[PDB]
Amino acid sequence: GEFITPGVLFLYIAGWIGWVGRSYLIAVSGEKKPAMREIIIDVELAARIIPRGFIWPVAAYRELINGDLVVDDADIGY
Amino acid sequence: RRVCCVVSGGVYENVLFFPVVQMLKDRYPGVLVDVVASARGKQVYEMCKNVRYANVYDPDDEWPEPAEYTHQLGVMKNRYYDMVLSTKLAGTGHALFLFMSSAREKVGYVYPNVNGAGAGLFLTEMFKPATTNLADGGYNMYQDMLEWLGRPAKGVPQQPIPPLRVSISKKLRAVVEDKYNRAGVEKGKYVVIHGIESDSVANMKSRGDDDCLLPLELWAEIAKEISSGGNGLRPLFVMPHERHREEIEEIVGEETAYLFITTPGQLTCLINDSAGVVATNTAAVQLANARDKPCVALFSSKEKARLFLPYVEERKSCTVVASATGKLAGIDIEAVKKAVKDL
Amino acid sequence: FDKGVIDGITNGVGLASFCIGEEIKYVGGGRISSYLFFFLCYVSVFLF
Amino acid sequence: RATWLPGLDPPAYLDGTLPGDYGFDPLGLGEQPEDLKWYVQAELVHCRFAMAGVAGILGTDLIRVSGIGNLPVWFEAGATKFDFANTTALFFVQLLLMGFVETKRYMDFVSPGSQAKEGTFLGIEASLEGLQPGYPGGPLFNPMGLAKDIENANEVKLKEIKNGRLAMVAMLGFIVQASVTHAGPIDNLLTHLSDPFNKNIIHAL
Amino acid sequence: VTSKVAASASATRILDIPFYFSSNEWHLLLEILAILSMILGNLLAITQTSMKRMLAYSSIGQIGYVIIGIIVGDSNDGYASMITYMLFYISMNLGTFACIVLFGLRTGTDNIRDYAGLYMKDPFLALSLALCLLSLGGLPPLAGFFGKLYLFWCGWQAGLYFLVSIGLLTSVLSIYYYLKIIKLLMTGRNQEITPYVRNYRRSNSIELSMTVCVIASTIPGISMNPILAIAQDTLF
Amino acid sequence: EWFPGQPRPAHLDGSSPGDFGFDPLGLATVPENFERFKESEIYHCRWAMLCVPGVLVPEALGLGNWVKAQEWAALPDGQATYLGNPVPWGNLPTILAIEFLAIAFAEQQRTMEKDPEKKKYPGGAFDPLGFSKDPAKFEELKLKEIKNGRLAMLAFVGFCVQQSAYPGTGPLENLATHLADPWHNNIGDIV
Ligand code: CLA
Ligand SMILES: CC(/C=C/C=C(C)/C=C/[C@@]12O[C@]1(C)C[C@@H](O)CC2(C)C)=C\C=C\C=C(C)\C=C\C=C(C)\C=C\[C@@]12O[C@]1(C)C[C@@H](O)CC2(C)C
Ligand SMILES: CC1=C(/C=C/C(C)=C/C=C/C(C)=C\C=C\C=C(C)\C=C\C=C(C)\C=C\C2=C(C)CCCC2(C)C)C(C)(C)CCC1
C-alpha cells in the first residue's frame, strides 16, 4: 500500500483519461471539420463516452489483440 | 422366442411398421411379438394378425417422472424378451433403456452426429440417419438385417414382405361400419375425402408443410362434380377426422347433404366399404393402397418416390397428381376431377 | 419436489443396480484367455 | 421486447438469438462480432463456476451452523488441512488437469470439431462438440443424453443464463459481505433477519 | 454342495493349524474376499434369466459369504455356527435343485420365463419350490433366517462391524429375484403361459428326496436347539 | 501433431523422422538451418541416451553419483576409481589429455564429411548387423531413436535441475525421497 497499491490505482485512472480522450477524437474524426468539435467540445457525445473508460483495460486489450490499437505505415493525411 | 418392438410416433409412421412385424413372424416362426408405442399410435394395432398385445409408454418425453419410468422397465424386463428391436433413434440415454431390458440382441437406430452422436457400446447393428422421411422405405435397414444374415435359412427370406396387408375383423367390419355409414347417406357406393383441417388427422409426421389440409374450397369444387352423374350419386363424405363439431358448421362444401363422421384410426373398414377415395398424402393413402380400393392421392410434387413406392398398386389403380408450383394448395383441380370422374 | 426428488432417489437407489449389474456383466464374457488374464491380475496385485 | 430499461431501445446488434438477450450492453462492449463471439463463453464459464461456487460457499456454512456437520468457513477454508495435501502440490495438480480441460475447450472454439479426430481411443467420439460452442454435450459429457439441441436451447438455456447471471452476482455479495462483516454469509443473513432495520449495511459501516 | 463342504472343511484346518501368527494378515485377506463375494455374486444374480445360472450366482456366488463370515471372526465360539449354517444350506439347496431337475425333465426347458402358471397345473411342486426359495431368502419362520441370524449374532459378538451390515444388506438385495420367480409361479393369465407348462402330465425316488429335503428347510430353523448343543464340541 | 488444433507451419510437411509440427520460433525457416538442426538434434539425442544410465546405474551400485564421480579432479592429487578400483591414469591431466585428443579427432572426423545425410545416419561400420535392411523398419527405427533421444534429454534436464534444487543428491535418491511421501515430497516444495 505504499507504492504498488497506490500505483495501480493511478494506472487505472490514467488510462481512463487516456482511453476516453482517444474515443472522442476517433468519434468526431469522421465529420466535416474535426477542428470545430474540439475547440467547442460536444458535451452530449462526451457524456455517452465518459463511462466507457470504466472498462478500458478490457476494451483496449481486445484492440491490441485484434490489431486496431495501432496503425502500420499510413501516417500523415490519412 | 419372444420379441418386443418399441416403434415410436403416431399413426402414419406406425402403420408402415406392419412389414417389419410380418417379416419377424415369417423369419422366426411361432414368435410372440409385442409392441410399445404412443397413445395415438397404439390405436393402429387393433387391425392386425401378428402382435400379441400392444402397450403405450413412449411419446418419448423429457422428464417422465421416475416411477412411470421404472414400472415400464419393470414390465419390459419381467417377461424376458430376446431381441428388443427399437426405433426413435437412440443416442446414449435411450440406449440404456434398451440395455437394462436383459435381452440377447438389441438392434436399433441411432443419431448420425447430432444429439450426442454416441450410439454406445452396449448395442448391436446401429445404423442410418434419424428423421425417418421416406415411406415404404421407412425402416429400410430392418428389412435387410433380418434377411438371411445367419444361416442355411433360404436366401434372403422374401425380401420386403408384401406391402401393407392389414386385415379387418368382421365384427368391427359389420357393426360399427354399418352404424356410422347409415347415419346419413349410405350405399357402399360413396367416396371418402380425408384432408380437411389440422387437429390430429394423421399429420404423417414427415410431410412437414403440405398435405396437412386443403382450404376446403378445392374440396367443394371437387365434390360438386363427384356425385354429378350416376357413377356414385351417393358420395358426399367430407369425412372430417377432426373435432369437426367445431367444423361441420362451416362446410362451405354446402351443408345441404355433405355428410360427416368422427373416427379413430379405425377408418380402414370405412375405406373398404367405399367405392374409392380421394385424399392428400396421409394414412388414407397407404390404407386404401393396402387393399384394392382404387385411391387418388394428391400431395405436393415428386414426393411419390418417398411416400408412395408401389406406383402401380394393382393396375396403376392408385394414381397420383403433383403440383407444378410445389405447394399443395395449387393444382390442376380440373384435371383432378377429370381423373376422379372415371371411378 | 416429491416425485421428482425423493421418488427419484428411492428409484435411483433401486435403478442404479439394474444398470450396474448388466454393465459389469458384459465385461469378459467367455474367451477363457480373458478368464485367465483377469484371474492373474488379482493374484498379482494381491501380492502387495 | 422487454429490455432491461423499459423506455430505452435495445442496441441494434443484440438482435436476440442469444439466450438472455435483454438488450443490455451500455458501454459499447460488444459491437464487434469476434469480440461478442468470444464474450459469450466467458459469461457461460463464469456463471457455471459461479453457480457451483456459491453453493459450496452456501451449503457448507448452512450445514455447519445447524450442526449436522462441521466445516470451516469458506473464508477460512484456504488454510485447512487433513493429510497428504501440500497446498503447493494441489495447486500444481489442479493447474494440470484444469490446464488440460481448459485448453482442449479453447482449441474447440478456435477450431470446431478439431478435437475428436485423433489416435487416443475409446473417447475420441464424444469430445467432438455439443454442436453449440458453449454446450459440449456428448455421450460422455451428457451421460443422460437428454437434449434435442435446438428447441429447448431457446427455452432452457434462458433458464441457465438467468440462473447464472443471478449466481454470479450472489458470489460477489459474499466477497464484499465477508470483507465487511468478517463473518459467514448466512451469519450475515441471520444477523440481518434479527433486526432488519438495525442490521443493515448503513450500520455495518 | 459337496465341493463347498469339502473346501470349507479343508480351509479352516489349513489356515488355523499352521498359521497361528499370520492371523492379522489373513483375517483381513479373507474379509476382502467375503465383502466382494456377497456383492458381485448378487448384482448379476438379478439380471439372470436362466435358472441354473441364477442359482450359480445366488446360492454359490453369494451364499459362500456368511460361512466365511465367521472363519475370520472365530475364537472357537463360532465354528458351531458354521456347522449349523452348512447343515441348513445343504438341505435348502438340494430341495430347490431336486425341484428344478424334476420340472426340467418333465417339461424340457430351463429359462425362467417358462415357470409361469406352474402353481395351477401341479401345486405341490410349486409349493415345495417356493418354500426352499423363500428359505434361501432367509425369512423368519424358515431355517435360512436362523442360519444367517446365529451367523451374525456370533460375528457381531466378535467386534467386526463392516461385514455384518453388508451381509444383511445383500440379503435384502437377494430377496428380489427369489420373490421374482415366486411371483412368476402364482399367475392365472391363461393367454400368457407358454405351451410348455400347458402340456404337463403331473403324476418314488425324486419325489421322496424333494419332500424329505424340503421339510428339513422349515423344521430345523425352529428346532435348532439340539443341533446347536451338538455343534459346540468342535476343537480343531 | 503435438498441439491438436493448430495448422502446420508450412515447412514441416512430415518428410522427416520425428517431425510433429513444432517450430513456434520459426527456427527452421532456412533449409540449411533446417538440416544442420537435425544433425545437432540427433547428436544431442545420441549422447544423452548414453549418459543417463551412466549417471544412474553407478548410483544403483555402491559407486557415487554423477557429481561425486567427477570430484577427485578438483583436488590436485586426484586419482580415479572405476568400479571402485584406483585406475593408475585417473589423474586429471592424464585423462584430460587422453580425452582431448580422442574426442577431437573422432569428432573432427565428423566435421570433415558432408553427405549430408550420412552426417545423421552413417551406418556401415556403425551398423555391424545391418538393421537398415528393411527401409520401412529403418525409417521407423529412426523414430524410436528420435523419441527415445528426446526422452533422454528431458531426463537429463530433470537430473541436472534436481541437482541445483537439491545439491549433492541422486536421481534415485530423489526418487526414493518422493517415494517416502509423494504428497509431501514434490516439485511443490521448491516454489
Ligand atoms: C486524449 C489525450 C491524449 C492521449 C491519449 C495522448 C497519448 C500519448 N501522448 Mg500526448 N498529449 C496530449 C494528449 C494526449 N496524448 C496533449 C493534449 C498534449 C499537449 C500538452 C500532449 C503532449 C504530449 C507530449 C509532449 C508527448 C506525448 C506523448 C504521448 C504518448 C505517450 C503517453 C505520454 O507520454 O503521455 C504524455 C502525457 C501528457 C503530456 C500529459 C498531457 C495530456 C493531457 C493531460 C490529456 C488531455 C486529455 C483530453 C484533454 C481529454 C479529452 C476529453 C474529451 C471527452 C473532451 C501517447 C501516444 C509522448 C510521446 O510521444 O511518447 C511516445 C510525448 O513526448 N503527448
Ligand atoms: C465466477 C464467480 C465465482 C465463482 C466462485 C467459486 C469458484 C467459489 C469457490 C469457493 O467457494 C467455494 C466453491 C469453496 C471454498 O472453500 C473455496 C472457494 C474458492 C472460496 C463469480 C463471477 C462473478 C462475476 C460477476 C458478478 C460479473 C459481473 C459483471 C458485470 C456486472 C458487468 C456488466 C457489464 O458488462 C456488461 C454486462 C455490459 C456492459 O455494457 C456494462 C457492464 C456494466 C460493463
Ligand atoms: C514490476 C515493478 C517494477 C518494474 C516495472 C517495469 C520494469 C516495467 C516495464 C515496463 C515496460 C517495459 C513497458 C513497455 C511498454 C511498451 C508499450 C508499447 C506500451 C504501450 C502502451 C500503450 C500503447 C497504451 C496505449 C493507450 C491505452 C491502452 C490507454 C491510454 C490510451 C492509449 C491509447 C495511450 C518496479 C521495479 C518499477 C517496481 C515494482 C513493480
UniProtKB/Swiss-Prot annotation, chain A:
Localization in the cell: Plastid, Chloroplast thylakoid lumen
Protein family: Belongs to the PsaF family.
Free-text function comment from the UniProt entry: Probably participates in efficiency of electron transfer from plastocyanin to P700 (or cytochrome c553 in algae and cyanobacteria). This plastocyanin-docking protein contributes to the specific association of plastocyanin to PSI.
The protein's name in its UniProt record: Photosystem I reaction center subunit III, chloroplastic
Name of the encoding gene: PSAF
Residues of the whole record sequence present: 158 to 235 of 235
